[PDB]
Design a binder for this molecule. Structure first.
Ligand SMILES: N[C@@H](Cc1c[nH]c[nH+]1)C(=O)O
Ligand SMILES: [Cl-]
Ligand code: NA
Length: 236
């Protein structure tokens, strides 16, 4: 039996987070556990870290796989292996306070400040748009607590962020700060596991397991539980 170390986070509610009993859980975590169950030649264990360190760790060989709703991009494919079978969609839109109707196009960001998560695909998508627009807006990276994305939108310190409907909808359920998506879909990447380029055997095994999880209806059930019925599909 080969031990596989999976890098993930703890700061994505319903995706990778610690519950009331200090147990790591959420969609990505539970999917990996389901995959492990179906691969008797492997044992999967987790290594939790800041999201921003996950691909630094993967690149240094300190984890074998990353599971954190990772969007496929050509930049990431130049460095890492993606498995073939997707396990979510992560369509990105500008996201604003529910009261704010001043922004639809990215052109409406001129002179404004956008807050995002360092190292995320959405940050890259925004960077490229900024450059296309002649550097006409500011991109900043969230911090913790009162400096997180939601709080900087609440106070007006940030005018917008970039996010996906399933995530926005879940956050809104319990928050005083209501966010909404606006405008066009800026990126429509699917979500996969990320591995080292040498890890072709493991990637194939993961795809076999994930396909069986799709085929028996388990992914439908897992996605309904964690993502909500509106975001739950038989396959992605
Ligand atoms: N989907 C993001 C990961 C993420 C961070 N926070 C929420 N999602 C990416 O591919 O970079
Ligand atoms: Cl196996
Ligand atoms: Na296993």
């Amino acid at each position: 039996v080969q031990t596989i170390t999976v890098g993930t986070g703890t700061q994505f509610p319903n995706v990778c987070f610690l519950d009331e009993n200090g147990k790591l859980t959420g969609y990505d975590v539970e999917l990996v556990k389901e995959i492990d169950k179906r691969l008797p030649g492997y044992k999967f264990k987790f290594k939790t870290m800041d999201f921003s360190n996950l691909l630094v760790s993967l690149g240094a060989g300190k984890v074998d796989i990353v599971a954190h709703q990772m969007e496929k991009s050509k930049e990431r494919e130049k460095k890492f292996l993606f498995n073939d079978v997707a396990y979510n969609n992560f369509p990105l839109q500008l996201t604003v306070l529910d009261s704010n109707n001043s922004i639809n196009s990215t052109k409406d960001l001129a002179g404004k400040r956008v807050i995002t998560s360092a190292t995320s695909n959405g940050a890259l998508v925004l960077k490229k748009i900024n450059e296309e627009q002649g550097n006409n807006f500011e991109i900043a990276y969230e911090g913790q607590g009162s400096n997180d994305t939601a709080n900087q939108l609440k106070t007006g310190r940030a005018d917008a962020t970039i996010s996906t409907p399933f995530a926005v909808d879940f956050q809104n359920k319990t928050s005083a700060i209501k966010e909404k998506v606006v405008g066009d879909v800026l990126s429509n990447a699917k979500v996969y596991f990320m591995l080292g380029k040498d890890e072709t055997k493991l990637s194939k095994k993961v795809d076999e397991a994930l396909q069986s999880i799709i085929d028996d209806g388990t992914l439908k059930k897992l996605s309904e539980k964690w993502l909500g019925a509106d975001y739950s599909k038989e396959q992605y």
